[PDB]
Amino acid sequence: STGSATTTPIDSLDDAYITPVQIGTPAQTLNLDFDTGSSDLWVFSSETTASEVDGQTIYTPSKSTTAKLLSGATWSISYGDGSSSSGDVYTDTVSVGGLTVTGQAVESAKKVSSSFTEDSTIDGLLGLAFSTLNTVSPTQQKTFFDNAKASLDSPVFTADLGYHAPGTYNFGFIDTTAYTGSITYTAVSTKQGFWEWTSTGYAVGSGTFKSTSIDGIADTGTTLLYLPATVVSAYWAQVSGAKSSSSVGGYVFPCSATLPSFTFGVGSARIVIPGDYIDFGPISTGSSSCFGGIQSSAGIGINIFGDVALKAAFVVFNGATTPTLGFASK
Numbered sequence: 026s027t028g029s030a031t032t033t034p035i036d037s038l039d040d041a042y043i044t045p046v047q048i049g050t051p052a053q054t055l056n057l058d059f060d061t062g063s064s065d066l067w068v069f070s071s072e073t074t075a076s077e078v079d080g081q082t083i084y085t086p087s088k089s090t091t092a093k094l095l096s097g098a099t100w101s102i103s104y105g106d107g108s109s110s111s112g113d114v115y116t117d118t119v120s121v122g123g124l125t126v127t128g129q130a131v132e133s134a135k136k137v138s139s140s141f142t143e144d145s146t147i148d149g150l151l152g153l154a155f156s157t158l159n160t161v162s163p164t165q166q167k168t169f170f171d172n173a174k175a176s177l178d179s180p181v182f183t184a185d186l187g188y189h190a191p192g193t194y195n196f197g198f199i200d201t202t203a204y205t206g207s208i209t210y211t212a213v214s215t216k217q218g219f220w221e222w223t224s225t226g227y228a229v230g231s232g233t234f235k236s237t238s239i240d241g242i243a244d245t246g247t248t249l250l251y252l253p254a255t256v257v258s259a260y261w262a263q264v265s266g267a268k269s270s271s272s273v274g275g276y277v278f279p280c281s282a283t284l285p286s287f288t289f290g291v292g293s294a295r296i297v298i299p300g301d302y303i304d305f306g307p308i309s310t311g312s313s314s315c316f317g318g319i320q321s322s323a324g325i326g327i328n329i330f331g332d333v334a335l336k337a338a339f340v341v342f343n344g345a346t347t348p349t350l351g352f353a354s355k
C-alpha cells in the first residue's frame with residue numbers, strides 16, 4: 026500500500042506545514058503538523074480545556090464508532106520552543122491520503138500551552154521521529170509510520186515541502202518526477218530517537234565550500250535552520266546591517282537586503298537553499314528589521330535541519346532495517 030497527502034504552509038512565512046488526516050469512523054478530518062522531530066500523534070479534542078481552544082478543529086472520541094480508550098494511558102510532551110501538551114489516549118483508525126492504520130494511538134489533549142491555542146490552523150501533531158521518543162505511559166505507543174511500515178510498498182516516507190506553495194508527504198513510495206538528479210543517501214543514528222545525520226559542510230552564497238562535519242536532525246517540525254555559531258556567524262557576516270539581537274532573540278537583518286543562498290553538503294552532493302527562503306519578515310508588525318531563517322544552535326544542544334533546509338530538497342526518510350536519509354535537489 027501507499028499514501029499521498031498535500032502539505033500546506035500555515036501562513037505567508039511558512040511558519041509550519043499542515044496536512045489533512047482522517048481520524049475515526051465516520052472520518053473526522055484534522056489538519057496536523059507532520060513532525061519528524063517528535064513521536065506523538067496528538068490532537069485538539071472534545072476534552073481540551075475550553076479556554077485553550079481557539080479556532081481549531083477537534084476530535085470527539087465519543088462520536089467515533091472505532092474509538093477505544095486505552096486504559097490508564099496518559100501522555101505529556103514538551104517541545105524545544107517551550108510549548109507543551111498532555112492528556113489521555115485512544116486507539117482509532119487513522120488515514121493519510123488513502124493509507125489506513127487501524128488501532129493507531131491518537132493522543133487526545135486535555136491541556137495545551139498558549140502557543141498551540143494561538144495557532145488556530147494547527148489541530149495537532151503527527152510524530153514521524155522513532156517510536157522510542159513516544160511519551161505514552163505506562164505503555165509506550167508506536168508512530169503512524171511504524172504501524173503502516175510493514176504494509177507499505179517500500180518502508181519509506183518522503184517530505185516535499187514547498188516555499189510559499191503546496192507540497193506533498195508520500196508514504197510507501199518514491200516519486201521519481203518530484204526531484205532532479207539523484208537521491209544521495211546518508212547514514213542515520215537513531216540513538217537520540219531522531220533522524221540524525223552528518224552534513225559534510227556548507228557554503229555561503231557563491232563562496233568556497235567548507236568541509237566540516239555538522240551533526241544535526243532532519244526536522245519538519247522545526248521552522249528554521251539551527252547551525253553552529255561559527256557557521257551562522259559566517260553566513261550573517263555576508264549581509265550588510267545584520268546583527269545578533271538579544272532582545273529579538275536571534276540574528277536580524279535590514280528588510281531591504283537580498284539574502285545570499287546557503288548550501289549544505291549531503292556526502293558529495295549539495296543542497297542550495299535560496300536566499301529568499303531565509304527571510305522571516307519583520308521582527309514586529311511594521312518594523313523595517315527582519316528576522317533571519319538561519320539561527321545559532323548554541324542554546325539548543327543539537328543542530329536542526331528544519332523546514333528552511335528541508336523545503337529546498339526532496340527528502341527520503343528510509344525506514345529500511347538500517348534507517349537512512351536521502352536528499353535530492355528539486
Ligand SMILES: Nc1ccc(F)cn1
Binds near residue numbers: 104105106108246247
Ligand atoms: N520544534 C518544535 C516546536 C513545537 C512543536 F510542536 C514541534 N516541534
